[PDB]
Amino acid sequence: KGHWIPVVAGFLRKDGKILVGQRPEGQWEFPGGKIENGETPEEALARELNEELGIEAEVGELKLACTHSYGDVGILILFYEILYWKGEPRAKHHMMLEWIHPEELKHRNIPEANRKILHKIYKALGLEW
Template sequence: MRYPVVAGLLQKEGKVLLAKRPAHKKRGGLWEFPGGKVEEGEAPREALRRELLEELGILVEVGEEVAVVDYDYPEVAIRLTCFSCQIKEGEPRALEGQELGWFEPEEIDNISLAPADVSLWRNLRKTLLQR
């Protein structure tokens, strides 16, 4: 079984928001697109709205699905779905001990991303770098 996970593509002035996983968590110290697990009975877009409010303190409008990646970690198989998001209210704040950063698309190639996010970035970068 693949567990559903969602991520948000948040952009501002051409930069992309990434979150660095806290050191005490699995894959600690690696960067990822903000988001999280989809709870049972929850729609993916609802899950992303909830996760971004909990983790970053922002209200977002969840837009189109921009990429889907299946990834097998040693302990779990996931399906990571990324949606384009627009911030409607608030400024992203690190509410769960993570570090946040806004990065130029060209910079992301040199950042240590979580493995599933590496695959996700490969899909997203073509689109973002063509704009």
């Protein structure tokens, strides 16, 4: 077997908080989405943040990559830091957007793929857990 879906996700950081979106009916995920053939990962992410949030984001440092399996398919998530953007994030894809202290992730319903690597996420934000 050998099937894979590459995904980009943004860590939008502001005032010590991180932006998280509630999946449509709800788990809380980092905004972003799938990489389309022909796009760089940074292009994909700028596009998805524009599509989901309506912002024009500067894609910053590549922080982390993780793999997870959904049985028949492999998922590869690339996590990029976003420190600068134009526009305000609006919930045009998610039922709810929320700024949270990274600490809250420990007690929010996030995808099990994100929960299993939460230690890596905090390290990737330069935080201790």
